[PDB]
Amino acid sequence: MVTQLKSASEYDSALASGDKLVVVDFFATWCGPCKMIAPMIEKFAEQYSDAAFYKLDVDEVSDVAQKAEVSSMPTLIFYKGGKEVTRVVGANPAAIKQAIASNV
């Protein structure tokens, strides 16, 4: 399951996980590719049980989106030990899957 982050607070606690891969999907409700990739992302969460998946609506938690420097949707950011390891800007199934598999 992909837990929606509702505040800056939730976002940050999500990140203090260490060693555990934390993956955040920055999306918008108006964003088409976001919608098309959302089912895939759920599949990936089932497969990669070693990693915690989340999503954050950029129009609800804007401050977090601006501080994470998200300027296109969807943007998947990969954290480990509270630090950004990488990110994928785009509804790119293959790149997202590889990013998860390789950083778990």
**Which residue type does 81 have?**
G
Q: Strand 83-89 to strand 75-80: parallel, antiparallel, or no bridges (unpaired)? A: antiparallel
21: burial class by Cβ within 10 Å (0-12, 13-18, 19+)?
buried
Please report, in angstroms and rounded to a whole number, the separation of the first and last CA atoms in the chain: 17
- The CB density around residue 13, as the number of other CB atoms within 10 Å, is 11
CATH code of the domain containing 83: 3.40.30.10
Enumerate residues 6+ apart whose C-beta is below 8 A from 69. Answer: none
Solved by what technique? X-ray
Catalytic site includes residue 17: no
Residues in the chain: 104
Integer angstrom CA distances of residue 83 from 1, 20, 34, 101: 22, 11, 24, 18
> How many structural domains does the chain have?
1
Which one of 31, 38, 85, 89 is the catalytic residue? 31
Catalytic site includes residue 31: yes
* Tokens found for residue 47: 């497969």
- Domain range holding 15? 1-104
Which one of 34, 41, 45, 76 is the catalytic residue? 34
